[PDB]
Specification:
Chain lengths: 51, 51
């Protein structure tokens, strides 16, 4: 994955996947990526009641 | 013929976390269908599972 808005960098990126498996995951806008996750799991937490 | 003139069991579904209400009873001539409409467990049910 990736996070950390400073992470969008030429050399970090270039220098990672190569020492690693496939292409680093993208497009989720890192500086919020985490907050995004939060909200998702919250949405789910409200979506409990199925009766 | 006049066969499969009976229903194996009372069929109903999952209310209020499992409380079971009948629509179909037992003994019922098989070529039939009964219909009923429930509503929301709780405000804003984004989705409903059926059991």
């Amino acid at each position: 994955i990736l996070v950390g808005g400073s992470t969008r960098i030429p050399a970090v990126q270039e220098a990672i996947k190569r020492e690693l498996g496939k292409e680093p995951h993208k497009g989720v806008n890192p500086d919020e990526v985490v907050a995004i996750g939060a909200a998702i799991q919250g949405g789910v937490i409200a979506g409990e009641v199925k009766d | 013929v006049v066969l499969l003139d009976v229903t194996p069991l009372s069929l109903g579904i999952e209310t209020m976390g499992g409380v079971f209400t009948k629509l179909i009873e037992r003994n019922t001539t098989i070529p039939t269908s009964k219909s009923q409409v429930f509503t929301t467990a709780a405000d804003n049910q984004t989705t409903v599972d059926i059991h």
